[PDB]
Amino acid sequence: IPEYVDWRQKGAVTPVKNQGSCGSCWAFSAVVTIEGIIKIRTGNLNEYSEQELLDCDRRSYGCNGGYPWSALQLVAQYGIHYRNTYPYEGVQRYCRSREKGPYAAKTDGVRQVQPYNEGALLYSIANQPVSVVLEAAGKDFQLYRGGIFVGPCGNKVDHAVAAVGYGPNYILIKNSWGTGWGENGYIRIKRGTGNSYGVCGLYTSSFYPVKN
Ligand SMILES: *[C@@H](C(=O)O)[C@H](O)C(=O)N[C@@H](CC(C)C)C(=O)NCCCCNC(N)=[NH2+]
Secondary structure (H helix, E strand, O other), rough: OOOOHHHHHOOOOOOOOOOOOOHHHHHHHHHHHHHHHHHHHHOOOEEEEEHEEEHHOOOOOOEEEOOOHHHHHHHHHOOOOOOOOOOOOOOEEEEEEEEHHOOOOOOOEEEEEOOOOOHHHHHHHHOEEEEEEEEEOOHHHOOOOOOOOOOOOOOOEEEEEEEEEEEEEEEEEEOOOOOOEEOEEEEEOOOOOOOOHHHHHHHOEEEEOOOO
16 A cells, blocks of 8 residues: 555545534544445545434434444445535434435445444545544644644543555544634644554444445
């Protein structure tokens, strides 16, 4: 795999979103990976609905948090609508998938990256955007403005994001806190430290969609 990957440069990443106060990061994270794999497999970049996963993933807890793997399983089992059809409201409401016509996109499964393994994660990122988790509660992460982030931070993961690239010393992350946070919405997180958890626990739990 190459020394640099940046899925934005291949036109496979949509604009940075803001989840607001709702604990919907798990849905935003999943949608980044759907938008990516559909561009990779079909040539077309579209925005898909975080709100639909928020409302409809019965294994998750709405704005009280959720699971990227369950959200991804939902898209593989049923499908997902365009963001325009099912726009983001920042609050969990009833599942309205049935009321909104046929699904826009569908995937074929979900796989997990072997946890606590930097190289396995890089291998997956070289193939597509990956849903990853990290510890975001620390004030160093909250106040991040730019550069390759080394912490301080622990490994108590609490925030789902999307890895959309990497370089020799970092993994490139699309956050869902708006374009004014970090590097226009992104953070580069230090890698290669020898810590099996990853910086801020970045290697704890990583999933990606499969599409034939
Ligand atoms: C993340 C966010 O929006 O910043 C959000 O709090 C979240 O989804 N957290 C997850 C953990 C990450 C995926 C690591 C979470 O806490 N999931 C478990 C669901 C919440 C616990 N149970 C109940 N009933 N609320």
